[PDB]
Structures are given as structure tokens and as C-alpha cells.
């Protein structure tokens, strides 16, 4: 329908009622095919998991809490583009951190 971040995770996809997650790939200008949605966003999550963290915490990490086994990840949200030889349903590539990423169905 239109695509939208998952309200639980900022590192998944709602798209057609479907579920799609970015690991990392980069997807080079030979297998991006054309223009598909523009993005506004950004989001901050704990990417072991991809826990998303509150507006609150992305300047205030914490001051005792020793953060020491959590990695949080700043992903802004870049256009969505085509992938050539494969459909949106499968796998697209979409524009993270400046860099077009593939993300793939997944079921949760």
C-alpha cells in the first residue's frame, strides 16, 4: 500500500501488510532498477536485537548503566528503489545511511 517502519522495529518494513528486514548488502547501481518511495524519518535501535530506543535516550545514553553490551544503531530513512530481476514482495533495496541496502521478507 504504502511503505511504513515497523511500529515495534526500525530495522523492519510493513509493506502490503508483508514483513521485510535489512541485514547489510550493498546494492550496486547494476542491480538497483528505478525510483519507488520517498523517506523522512530516523530511528535508534540495539541492533543485536533491534530493540528500538526512545527519543529520550538518543543524546542521554545513561550515565551508570555501562553500555558496554549494547550497540545502537542510528538509521536514517533514504528513498526506496527497484531491484533489477527481482519484485518488491521478494526483496528491494532501500537508501541507509546514504547507502542502498537489500532487505528481504521475513515472518516476524
Do not use: C
Not at 39 to 55: H, N, T, W, Y
Not at 89 to 105: M, P, R
Amino acid at each position: 500500500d504504502n511503505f511504513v517502519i515497523d511500529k515495534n522495529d526500525s530495522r523492519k518494513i510493513d509493506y502490503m501488510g508483508n514483513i521485510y528486514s535489512i541485514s547489510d548488502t550493498t546494492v550496486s547501481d547494476e542491480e538497483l532498477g528505478e525510483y519507488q518511495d520517498v523517506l523522512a524519518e530516523v530511528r535508534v535501535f540495539d541492533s543485536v536485537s533491534g530493540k528500538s530506543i526512545p527519543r529520550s535516550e538518543w543524546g542521554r545514553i545513561d550515565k551508570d548503566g555501562s553500555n558496554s553490551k549494547q550497540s545502537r544503531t542510528e538509521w536514517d530513512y533514504g528513498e526506496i528503489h527497484s531491484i533489477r530481476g527481482k519484485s518488491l514482495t521478494e526483496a528491494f533495496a532501500v537508501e541507509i545511511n546514504d547507502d542502498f541496502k537489500l532487505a528481504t521478507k521475513v515472518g516476524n
